[PDB]
Structures are given as structure tokens and as C-alpha cells.
């Protein structure tokens, strides 16, 4: 019932929809990493692509420019509804006021005042379109406490010829005269489980029915790990948001009925004739 | 005149100073003459 | 003052020039500065004195025309540079050739500047207390100026 109540953003006192101008930055989605699968282009090359599913992605809170402490405003975008029985009372109270089921993860997106979206607005995979380069960031797989060789790729010491109890150990820590170890030295420690970002990942296809985006290459995190998809910040992709929906796509608006699967021009769709390199 | 942490305390204390004045209990009063032989 | 008016016919016309104040305090002063008993009593901040020797765009006038003795032709020239760098002559800015705008960077307030800001390198190794390197303040040419302090002015800070 709560999810259905918010199914119609545009018919629920939406905020003004200002037009796009140069320098605008949109909001981004939080998706679940289903896995990977192969993909082919009309040139015949195979591109490894990963599947990201948007699940109950609803904007939660809207801070203003000044209070946010940044130049830009900031929106919070939660996803992946979870149970209510094992959450602190404070979190449940905040979600009850918002009128939405609790979400697994919160993240902050820097959004210009023109592109602001009212809190509680549902977000879908139609926010993106094939072609747009996108950036994904998530916690890396945690590998636990590891040695200096595996963590930083230290060469190590030979196994034979007399090396006695020294095979994977670090070498000389630092210089002798300084009588100390420089801060930040590479030493054995826990690896992984650190927030990292991948930049310039093209969007190959968008599945509207299941809200699945096909993102080129590898994305950080384990399978079923939540990520933070966002419009790419690289200089070449500075003004790729103009063509796409400026605030977002509202299916409830029903401006246009999109197909289930959206492809890029180079992508070779299945069921097409076999590729011939004429 | 009176000093205070707040205006009300300063106002209340300022009254204390005046009452001494009228009664001449200002600390700078002529010291009691304990040394009179008589 | 002879100035050229263009019309092509261009004509230079002599116009009346302001006359110098008569009765200098010191009669027969060989150099104009000494005539007025200002030999060793002027500094960079004396805009009124310095302005009397400067071209409309901030350039120095020739010694001959000004009449100052070389000793006071260099000191006056040195003080003028300090005044310009300190923004004490806002109405004598350089002539912009083709309406070019200023650099638009904010101007750092400076005074008693011996050298051009562009030509001074930073002192990365300050030096220790005994060997400490000094930063120039003022100019040596003003050594003889009257001092109203207990001890001589410290040129190097």
C-alpha cells in the first residue's frame, strides 16, 4: 500500500520542472548487482557487461545549498527495501514520516537547483538511456587481513638457496638514519571492503520491464551488492545529460510508452540476422 | 552602580549598593575607632 | 603647454601653463627641491610633491625640464615607483592601447616596495637566526632623510 501511494509522482503536487541549461547535474540511482553476461556488437567483438537492477529507488531527503555546506544542493537516494523488524527505532520513525518502506542504503547525490526532485519520488531504470557513459561506485570485496605480497604486490623472497623463514615478508621498512618509519608505509593489513569508483562505463542497454541497466566492463563489489550509479564526471561526458530526461523519467506521466528493451546503435540485438563482415 | 551576570541581578545588586550609601556602610567608611582610650 | 589638435590638418597650439609659487623659503636654492627646503624631508607617501614631476600617464619627466639635480632626480624617481606600486596615484594609470582590460586579479596592498613584484623570487631557505636572509624594505637612496626615531631605520626586515 505504501509503495502504491507514491507510484504517481506527477499527480502528487510535483515541484516545478525547470528546463535544462548548460552546467546542470542530475540525480543518480542505486542498483543491485545481479551478475555478468556476454554481449556482442555489430562489429563482432564481445564486450563483457554487467547487469544492474534498480529496486525501489526513492529519493528520501532534500538538503538546500547553504545547509548542505557545498556549493551544490544534495539529494538522498535510497534503494533495496528491507525488513522492519531489525532496525533502530530512529530509522523507522524517519521512514514512517516519509511514508515509504525502509531502504538498505543511503547515499548523497550532488544535484543542481534546477534538477531538484521532490522527496519520495520513485526512480526507475528509465532515468538512463543506451549510449550514456555512466560511473559506478561501491564497496570492494573484503579479503581480510593479508600479507604485504598480496596486498601491494611485493615481489617477496626466493623459496630456496638458503632463505630461512623469509618468503613473503616485507623487506626493509625504511631508512636506518631516520630512526623511524614514515607514515603511510605499505604494511600488512586488511584488504578490500573499501569504497571505490569506476569511471567512464558505457550503458549498452536498458531493460524497462525489469529495470536492468547493462554497464560495460567490471563494477566494484560482490554480486548482489548495492552500487551508486551516476552520470559520468569525465570531461568528455560533461554535457551528455542534455539529451536524456532532465529531472528524471516519470512513467506515471505516460508522455511516451517506451519499449521493454532499449539498445545502442552498435549493439547487435538477438534474433537479428547473423553478422556478416562484408 | 552595580555589576551583575544579568540585568536583573545587576539591577538587584545596584539597589544593594545604594542602601549601603544611605546607611553609610560603604567599605571605605572611616574605620571603627577601637583604639580610643576612653 | 603646446598640444596637437587634429582635423587632414593637425595644429599644435601653445596654451597657458600654471605658474610656480613665488618666494621659495630658501632663496637662491641651486636645485628646485632645496629652493623649497625639502631636500631631506620627502618620502614616497608625499603624493602632492611627487605629482609635480610626473607625466599624465605616470611616466617621469626629463631632468632638464623639471630642473632637479641628479641627486634628487634619482630619489624622486625611486619614490615615484614606490607610490605607483602602493596605489597612491590612481589617476595616473597606464594608457590602455586598444581598450584592453586590466589583469582583473585583486591587487595586494604593498608599500615601501624597492623592486618590481614580478622580478623578486621567493626565499625558500629562510636561513637560521645568525645567517637569516633579509627582505628588503625601502630604498638605500633615502638614507640621508631625517629620522625621528631613537635608532636608524631598519631597511632589511
Amino acid at each position: 500500500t505504501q509503495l502504491t501511494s507514491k507510484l504517481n509522482p506527477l499527480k502528487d503536487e510535483p515541484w516545478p520542472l525547470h528546463p535544462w541549461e548548460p552546467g546542470s547535474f542530475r540525480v543518480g540511482l542505486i542498483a543491485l548487482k545481479l551478475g555478468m553476461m556476454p554481449l556482442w556488437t555489430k562489429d563482432g567483438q564481445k564486450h563483457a557487461v554487467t547487469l544492474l537492477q534498480v529496486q525501489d529507488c526513492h529519493v528520501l531527503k532534500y538538503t538546500p545549498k547553504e545547509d548542505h555546506n557545498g556549493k551544490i544542493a544534495a539529494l538522498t537516494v535510497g534503494g533495496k527495501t528491507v525488513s522492519r523488524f531489525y532496525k533502530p527505532d530512529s530509522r523507522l520513525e524517519f521512514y514512517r514520516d516519509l511514508g515509504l518502506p525502509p531502504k538498505q542504503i543511503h547515499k548523497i547525490f550532488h544535484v543542481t537547483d534546477n534538477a531538484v526532485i521532490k522527496p519520495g519520488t520513485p526512480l526507475y531504470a528509465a532515468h538512463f538511456r543506451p549510449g550514456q557513459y555512466v560511473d559506478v561506485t561501491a564497496k570492494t570485496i573484503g579479503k581480510g587481513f593479508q600479507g604485504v605480497m598480496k596486498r601491494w604486490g611485493f615481489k617477496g623472497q626466493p623459496a630456496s638457496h638458503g632463505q630461512t623463514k623469509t618468503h613473503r615478508r616485507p623487506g626493509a621498512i625504511s631508512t636506518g638514519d631516520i630512526a623511524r618509519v614514515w607514515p603511510g608505509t605499505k604494511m600488512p593489513g586488511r584488504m578490500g571492503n573499501q569504497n571505490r569508483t569506476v569511471y567512464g562505463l558505457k550503458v549498452w542497454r536498458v531493460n524497462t520491464k525489469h529495470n536492468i541497466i547493462y554497464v560495460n566492463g567490471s563494477v566494484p563489489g560482490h554480486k548482489n551488492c548495492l552500487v551508486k550509479i551516476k552520470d559520468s564526471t569525465l570531461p568528455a561526458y560533461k554535457d551528455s545529460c542534455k539529451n536524456l530526461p532532465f529531472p528524471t523519467y516519470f512513467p506515471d506521466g505516460d508522455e511516451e510508452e517506451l519499449p521493454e528493451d532499449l539498445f545502442d546503435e552498435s549493439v547487435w540485438q538477438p534474433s537479428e540476422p547473423s553478422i556478416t563482415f562484408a | 552602580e552595580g555589576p551583575g551576570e544579568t540585568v536583573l541581578v545587576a539591577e538587584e545588586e545596584a539597589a544593594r549598593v545604594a542602601l549601603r550609601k544611605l546607611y553609610g556602610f560603604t567599605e571605605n567608611r572611616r574605620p571603627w575607632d577601637y583604639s580610643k582610650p576612653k | 603647454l603646446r598640444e596637437v589638435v587634429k582635423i587632414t590638418v593637425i595644429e599644435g597650439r601653445i596654451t597657458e601653463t600654471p605658474k610656480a609659487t613665488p618666494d621659495p623659503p630658501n632663496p637662491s636654492g641651486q636645485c628646485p627641491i632645496c629652493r623649497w627646503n625639502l631636500k631631506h624631508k620627502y618620502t614616497y607617501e608625499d603624493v602632492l610633491l611627487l605629482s609635480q614631476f610626473i607625466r599624465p600617464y605616470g611616466g617621469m619627466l626629463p631632468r632638464r625640464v623639471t630642473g632637479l639635480c641628479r641627486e634628487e632626480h634619482r630619489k624622486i624617481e625611486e619614490c615615484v615607483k614606490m607610490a605607483h606600486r602602493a596605489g597612491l596615484l590612481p589617476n595616473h594609470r597606464p594608457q590602455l592601447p586598444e581598450g584592453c582590460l586590466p589583469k582583473d586579479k585583486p591587487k595586494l596592498n604593498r608599500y615601501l616596495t624597492r623592486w618590481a613584484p614580478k622580478s623578486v623570487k621567493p626565499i625558500y631557505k629562510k636561513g637560521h637566526r645568525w645567517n637569516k636572509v633579509g627582505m628588503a624594505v625601502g630604498s638605500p637612496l633615502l638614507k640621508d632623510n631625517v629620522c625621528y626615531s631613537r635608532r636608524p631605520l631598519k631597511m632589511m626586515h
Binding site: - | - | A116, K118, S119
Partner: protein, 37 residues
């Protein structure tokens, strides 16, 4: 722009300049005579 302890004019056309805190002799006729301190 050879950096030398002493700057000496190599031709009559040579002239002296004080650029960016150092002394320069630049010769219009011959760029070879250009020097720095």
C-alpha cells in the same frame, strides 16, 4: 643566453637591459651576442 659572471658588449649595436632582475645584452644584428647574467 650564456650565463656568465661578467657581461661584456661584443658589438657596437649591442645594448644593455635589466629584465626580470638580471642584466641582459641583446644585439639586433646578431642573436649570438645575446647573453644573461
Amino acid at each position: 643566453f650564456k650565463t656568465k659572471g661578467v657581461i661584456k658588449k661584443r658589438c657596437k649595436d649591442c645594448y644593455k637591459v635589466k629584465r626580470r632582475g638580471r642584466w641582459f645584452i641583446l644585439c639586433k644584428t646578431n642573436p649570438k651576442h645575446k647573453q644573461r647574467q
